[PDB]
Amino acid sequence: ATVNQLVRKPRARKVAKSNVPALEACPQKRGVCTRVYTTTPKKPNSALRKVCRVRLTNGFEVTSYIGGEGHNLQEHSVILIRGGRVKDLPGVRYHTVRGALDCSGVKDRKQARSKYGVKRPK
Amino acid sequence: SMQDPIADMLTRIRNGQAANKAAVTMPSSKLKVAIANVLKEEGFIEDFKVEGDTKPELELTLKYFQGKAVVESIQRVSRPGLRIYKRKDELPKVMAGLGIAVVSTSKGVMTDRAARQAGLGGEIICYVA
RNA sequence: GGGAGAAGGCACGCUGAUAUGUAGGUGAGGUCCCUCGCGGAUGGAGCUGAAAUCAGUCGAAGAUACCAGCUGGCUGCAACUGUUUAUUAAAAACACAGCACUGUGCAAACACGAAAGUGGACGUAUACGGUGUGACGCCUGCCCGGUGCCGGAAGGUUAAU
RNA sequence: UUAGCUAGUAGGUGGGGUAACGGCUCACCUAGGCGACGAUCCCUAGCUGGUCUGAGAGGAUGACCAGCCACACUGGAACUGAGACACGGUCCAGACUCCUACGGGAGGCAGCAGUGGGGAAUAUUGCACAAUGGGCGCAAGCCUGAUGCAGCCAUGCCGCGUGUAUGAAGAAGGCCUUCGGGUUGUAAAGUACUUUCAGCGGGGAGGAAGGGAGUAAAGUUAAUACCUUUGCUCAUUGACGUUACCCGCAGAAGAAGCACCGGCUAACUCCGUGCCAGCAGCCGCGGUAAUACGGAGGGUGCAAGCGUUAAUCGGAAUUACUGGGCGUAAAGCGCACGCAGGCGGUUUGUUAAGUCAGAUGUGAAAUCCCCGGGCUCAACCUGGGAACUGCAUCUGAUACUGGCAAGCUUGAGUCUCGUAGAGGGGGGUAGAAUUCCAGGUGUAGCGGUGAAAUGCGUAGAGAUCUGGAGGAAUACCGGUGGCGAAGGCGGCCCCCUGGACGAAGACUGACGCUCAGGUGCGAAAGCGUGGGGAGCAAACAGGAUUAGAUACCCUGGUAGUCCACGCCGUAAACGAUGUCGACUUGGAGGUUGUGCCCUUGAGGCGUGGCUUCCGGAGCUAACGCGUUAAGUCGACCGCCUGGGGAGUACGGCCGCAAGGUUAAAACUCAAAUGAAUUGACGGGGGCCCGCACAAGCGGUGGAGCAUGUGGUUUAAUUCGAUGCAA
RNA sequence: AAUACGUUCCCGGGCCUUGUACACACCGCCCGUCACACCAUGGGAGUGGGUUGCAAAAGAAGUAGGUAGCUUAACCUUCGGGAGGGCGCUUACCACUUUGUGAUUCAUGACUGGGGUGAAGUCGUAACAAGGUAACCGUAGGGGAACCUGCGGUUGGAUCA
Numbered sequence A: 001a002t003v004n005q006l007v008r009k010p011r012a013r014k015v016a017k018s019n020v021p022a023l024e025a026c027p028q029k030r031g032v033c034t035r036v037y038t039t040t041p042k043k044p045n046s047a048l049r050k051v052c053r054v055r056l057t058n059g060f061e062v063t064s065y066i067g068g069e070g071h072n073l074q075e076h077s078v079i080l081i082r083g084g085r086v087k088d089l090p091g092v093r094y095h096t097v098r099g100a101l102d103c104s105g106v107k108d109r110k111q112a113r114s115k116y117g118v119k120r121p122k
Numbered sequence B: 001s002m003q004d005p006i007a008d009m010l011t012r013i014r015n016g017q018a019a020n021k022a023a024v025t026m027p028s029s030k031l032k033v034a035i036a037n038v039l040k041e042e043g044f045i046e047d048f049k050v051e052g053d054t055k056p057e058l059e060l061t062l063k064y065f066q067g068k069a070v071v072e073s074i075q076r077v078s079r080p081g082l083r084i085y086k087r088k089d090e091l092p093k094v095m096a097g098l099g100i101a102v103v104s105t106s107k108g109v110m111t112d113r114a115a116r117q118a119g120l121g122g123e124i125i126c127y128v129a
Numbered sequence C: 001g002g003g004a005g006a007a008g009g010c011a012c013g014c015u016g017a018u019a020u021g022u023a024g025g026u027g028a029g030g031u032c033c034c035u036c037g038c039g040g041a042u043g044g045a046g047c048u049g050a051a052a053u054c055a056g057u058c059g060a061a062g063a064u065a066c067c068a069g070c071u072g073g074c075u076g077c078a079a080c081u082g083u084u085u086a087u088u089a090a091a092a093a094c095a096c097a098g099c100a101c102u103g104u105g106c107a108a109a110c111a112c113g114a115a116a117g118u119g120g121a122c123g124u125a126u127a128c129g130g131u132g133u134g135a136c137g138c139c140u141g142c143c144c145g146g147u148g149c150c151g152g153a154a155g156g157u158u159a160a161u
Numbered sequence D: 001u002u003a004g005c006u007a008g009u010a011g012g013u014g015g016g017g018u019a020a021c022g023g024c025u026c027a028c029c030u031a032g033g034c035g036a037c038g039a040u041c042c043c044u045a046g047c048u049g050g051u052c053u054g055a056g057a058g059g060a061u062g063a064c065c066a067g068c069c070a071c072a073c074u075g076g077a078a079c080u081g082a083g084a085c086a087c088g089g090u091c092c093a094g095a096c097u098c099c100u101a102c103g104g105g106a107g108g109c110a111g112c113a114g115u116g117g118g119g120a121a122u123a124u125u126g127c128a129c130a131a132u133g134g135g136c137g138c139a140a141g142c143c144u145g146a147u148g149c150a151g152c153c154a155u156g157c158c159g160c161g162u163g164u165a166u167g168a169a170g171a172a173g174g175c176c177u178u179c180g181g182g183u184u185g186u187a188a189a190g191u192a193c194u195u196u197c198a199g200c201g202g203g204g205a206g207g208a209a210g211g212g213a214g215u216a217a218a219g220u221u222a223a224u225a226c227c228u229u230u231g232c233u234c235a236u237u238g239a240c241g242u243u244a245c246c247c248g249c250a251g252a253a254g255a256a257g258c259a260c261c262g263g264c265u266a267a268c269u270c271c272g273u274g275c276c277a278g279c280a281g282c283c284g285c286g287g288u289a290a291u292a293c294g295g296a297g298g299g300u301g302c303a304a305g306c307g308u309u310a311a312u313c314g315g316a317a318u319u320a321c322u323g324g325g326c327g328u329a330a331a332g333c334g335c336a337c338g339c340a341g342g343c344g345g346u347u348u349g350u351u352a353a354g355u356c357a358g359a360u361g362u363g364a365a366a367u368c369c370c371c372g373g374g375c376u377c378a379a380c381c382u383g384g385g386a387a388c389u390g391c392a393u394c395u396g397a398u399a400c401u402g403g404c405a406a407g408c409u410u411g412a413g414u415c416u417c418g419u420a421g422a423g424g425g426g427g428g429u430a431g432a433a434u435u436c437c438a439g440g441u442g443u444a445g446c447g448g449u450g451a452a453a454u455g456c457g458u459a460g461a462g463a464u465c466u467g468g469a470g471g472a473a474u475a476c477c478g479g480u481g482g483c484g485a486a487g488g489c490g491g492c493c494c495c496c497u498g499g500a501c502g503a504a505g506a507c508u509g510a511c512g513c514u515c516a517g518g519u520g521c522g523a524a525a526g527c528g529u530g531g532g533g534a535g536c537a538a539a540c541a542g543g544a545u546u547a548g549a550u551a552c553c554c555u556g557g558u559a560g561u562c563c564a565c566g567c568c569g570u571a572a573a574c575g576a577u578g579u580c581g582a583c584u585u586g587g588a589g590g591u592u593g594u595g596c597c598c599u600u601g602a603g604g605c606g607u608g609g610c611u612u613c614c615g616g617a618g619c620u621a622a623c624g625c626g627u628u629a630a631g632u633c634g635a636c637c638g639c640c641u642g643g644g645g646a647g648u649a650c651g652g653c654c655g656c657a658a659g660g661u662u663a664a665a666a667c668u669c670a671a672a673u674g675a676a677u678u679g680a681c682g683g684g685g686g687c688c689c690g691c692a693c694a695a696g697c698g699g700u701g702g703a704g705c706a707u708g709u710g711g712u713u714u715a716a717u718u719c720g721a722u723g724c725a726a
Numbered sequence E: 001a002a003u004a005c006g007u008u009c010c011c012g013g014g015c016c017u018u019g020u021a022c023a024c025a026c027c028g029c030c031c032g033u034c035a036c037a038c039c040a041u042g043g044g045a046g047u048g049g050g051u052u053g054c055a056a057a058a059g060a061a062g063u064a065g066g067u068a069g070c071u072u073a074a075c076c077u078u079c080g081g082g083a084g085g086g087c088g089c090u091u092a093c094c095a096c097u098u099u100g101u102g103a104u105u106c107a108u109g110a111c112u113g114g115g116g117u118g119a120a121g122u123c124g125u126a127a128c129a130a131g132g133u134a135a136c137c138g139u140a141g142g143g144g145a146a147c148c149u150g151c152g153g154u155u156g157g158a159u160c161a
């Protein structure tokens, strides 16, 4: 790494890829759910996480985790995915924006309500 | 081979001081005479002495204080692979004023403090810290 | 090396100019030498003569007639050029260079001939006969029980005498 | 993982053309030009002043604002004109949309609004030329979807408000509790005080300078007309506008949410769950006391915003120029030669290219920054200043570097003379041994392992003596000894030959070092052609052991090993340590010279070269390396950026072939790794014991019974213990 | 009563040392075919789009060059016409369009080479201690698979009384 070696062959920069490639640098892209199905995660956890397999707006086909405690999602219904890797489901990188545009919020949740789309209680 | 006589001189000073020599010796030259003159002026050697008619040996008598070395660190700046020519505002100030930096200016070889008081840059040969 | 003339496309007549026939070829004179003759140099007259460019013009069509590749893609079989069922079969059959095995020490093995002899060969294991396979690349795996062939002559059976 | 490209192509001469030079365009000629300092080709992209980040060097990026370029449905072409090859012009062709009397016609929002569509996502089919600027006009004036303003949007930045004070019955109520109580909490109620902003009414600047009439003075002028300049009285010209701002009214009224609380990260307890529901930015939570999930109470942080996502930079010294690393963590080409390139000892003289210094031109303004001014403050607007780290020009200086010219001798090399050497290439030859053959003896076993067997043997083997034949390797010397650049090289002799090192001299006089591409050598295995073929021996067969054993072990045994020619170009090609060169305490040996001293006996005092072990400061993550450095440095080259995927695919070059070389991605995990430490473990070692084994006596397991258990059976056969240690 | 010669092995311990890829700590962790599912990746008879090179055909309007024809107000003119112009024809250049043929890139494609992840699946036990045959590197052959064997190399291998 002398300066003659540097001008003969330059110091190559450190480029790297985005971990959410299907969003196309859009913060929320709108997907149509083709499937909604449960999967048990990879060990040492054990549950039945709900992954909705959506076809995005730009032709991409990705599954995406569903948050909250329970849901209402079927197929044929447009939702918004927002990125963010769920650690324990192998090969799922997106969450669904709970509250957005067909997927209503959790039932009777009182705290953290903006993250799950629930109006103020009176 | 001997691709840097000035770094030969500086490495000999650093080695002799870190190995507790008293009178180190090297082959002489005009730039070595000028740099050793700067060091004897500022007080990083006791006295230098160039002996020899056709090809001489320059001898440097090293200083000590309480056993420890006097030159704490000494290094090149403008090595021959990559030379460092510096303008007057972009001059160094090694060790926040304490150490000296030898600059060859148009008016011979002189310490960077004298270079700032004469108002011209040059080439930085060493950072006697 | 090939493929390949791959495919595919353009120009093509006549007339005028360059040039009253060009470049090139041939070389008469004439002049000088000349070891003097069917000798050699500049010398280019005359003769012949492409081919190209520009312009003009004609026809519907300029290689105008006769002569004169159909081309491309995938694949089988065979390496190819060759040869054959004269006279229903020309091939995927036969051969082939190459590979291997085997026989043969020269009065060769082998064949044709009772035999002489001759081919082998006026050659001598890098040669010759026979057999199978059929360029080149990657390769040729297991079995000696059967039938052959080669080595044994210790033993059983064994002919003429 | 694009090495060739270029036919008007590079240049010339002549003609033409252009506002202007020019292959701009032609005729003819020359055969050139571009290219590893990246031509050509592919993909992406408007560029810049700047903006975001960064301490800084940089990285990303080009929204508003400003400059420049390009385009105006797509593809062309020219005209008019000063200026276009023309946004709201012409002509041609095309797709789309629309009208038709079917002959034909028309149109181009990437102008401002707006619509449909796409999208996660981005506004009114608003008022005025009052201001600034533009176009025309002598002007008045007209046009002006530029511009000034209004509407929308928490999109950002900034400012303000939701009261203030008193107030302990520490009220109730919630929540928790060791049932004392704590907490919500001076918080609420209460009593007193204020009215910012929103609402109600009143006053109201400034953005307005101009323009239009008339008059006075002057200038032209034959002219006191006309016109222009200078003043002088008049009504005057605002979309914003219900303006900025000021003043008065009445009342605490009309005005607080979001995220988080296991660590990182400020903030903890109860209840509901029970590997379910779920959270997650990473480490991990959840299996019956969850500070991590859901709810409550409490708190912490931000606040008219709070978060989640996306995107950049930082942290990331995690692409390192400032600012990394290479023995073992990923990383030194297998080794050498060497062109370009990079660097270059020492003395003098010149030049002054690089360097430095002053001045000049310049770096548009805006922004950034420093002082300042204004909008009540801030955001914002704005004056002056440096900066604009640059570029060019002039003028200097001469230390370094460069050029140029002359010198030196230490670096590099040449000669003279030896020494040491398994250095290489070619040809001879020697003995020991193995095998095969042939012959003699002589008899029943040989060979083999852990134990056997297949095999060889009554056709006379193995042992044994003689004569051959053949091929290969060279016992002892032999030693971390030597030589070579690396691979490597091992009996002896000859022929050819390279290199090293030492001594006194002499000589050339920077001729040096490193080296991308390029080339040459490069173990073994492998391939081709042709020989040889004793041993050994993959493949293969048979025998065993085994659960099976396509292995180890045994009996055989073909490639191959070997010789000559080539090809492959790989190895844990290792010192896992690129080359060169300098300097830095020592000891122990070995090897090969050499100087001296009396080699006074197989000594002793030094200097070289080469080489192995211990070790100091230094260094190192530690281990360890340690004058042969992994110490302190310099020159040049190679290489690495998490583990896999993978030194693999594809593509190129090479290869007859096996394959070599160059060499990614998608995905996937939060690790993979190096050194050392404590344990544990070993069919590792050493030492030692124990009824462990040995040496002995007796017993169970066989039979019958007692008793406990596992199973079955049942209405219940209660429950618990279940390796030793039930 | 019997027997103890002794430590060669048998298991369980104790201490030092060494090696380690093991720490619920060898009853440890670990490697590869096979069977099923899923994802991405290459080859794949091909097939369909995008862009683009080449060689060519092509010729609307426009310009520039020429000209038989028709025609014309500005100049000369003897009034005859002359110059010059316009239209028209034509040649040059060039767009749309057309054919042929490559180059690149994307999508898709039965089937397949390998790769990765998965619930107590099947067959083994190759590696880590001398891992029970020391491992490993290269290369070749073989084989259900870890791998085994040949030839050469390395210590990054263990025991040294």
Ligand SMILES: [Mg+2]
Pocket (backbone or CB within 6 Å): C076
């Ligand atoms: Mg067929």
Ligand SMILES: [Mg+2]
Pocket (backbone or CB within 6 Å): C078
């Ligand atoms: Mg044939």
Ligand SMILES: [Mg+2]
Pocket (backbone or CB within 6 Å): none
């Ligand atoms: Mg034929």
Ligand SMILES: [Mg+2]
Pocket (backbone or CB within 6 Å): C083
């Ligand atoms: Mg015939």
Ligand SMILES: [Mg+2]
Pocket (backbone or CB within 6 Å): C085
């Ligand atoms: Mg016939």
Ligand SMILES: [Mg+2]
Pocket (backbone or CB within 6 Å): none
């Ligand atoms: Mg015939």
Ligand SMILES: [Mg+2]
Pocket (backbone or CB within 6 Å): none
């Ligand atoms: Mg026939």
Ligand SMILES: [Mg+2]
Pocket (backbone or CB within 6 Å): none
């Ligand atoms: Mg005969």
Ligand SMILES: [Mg+2]
Pocket (backbone or CB within 6 Å): none
């Ligand atoms: Mg045949």
Ligand SMILES: [Mg+2]
Pocket (backbone or CB within 6 Å): none
């Ligand atoms: Mg055949």
Ligand SMILES: [Mg+2]
Pocket (backbone or CB within 6 Å): none
């Ligand atoms: Mg066969």
Ligand SMILES: [Mg+2]
Pocket (backbone or CB within 6 Å): C144
């Ligand atoms: Mg037989």
Ligand SMILES: [Mg+2]
Pocket (backbone or CB within 6 Å): C144
């Ligand atoms: Mg037989």
Ligand SMILES: [Mg+2]
Pocket (backbone or CB within 6 Å): none
């Ligand atoms: Mg056989």
Ligand SMILES: [Mg+2]
Pocket (backbone or CB within 6 Å): none
């Ligand atoms: Mg026989």
Ligand SMILES: [Mg+2]
Pocket (backbone or CB within 6 Å): none
């Ligand atoms: Mg010209």
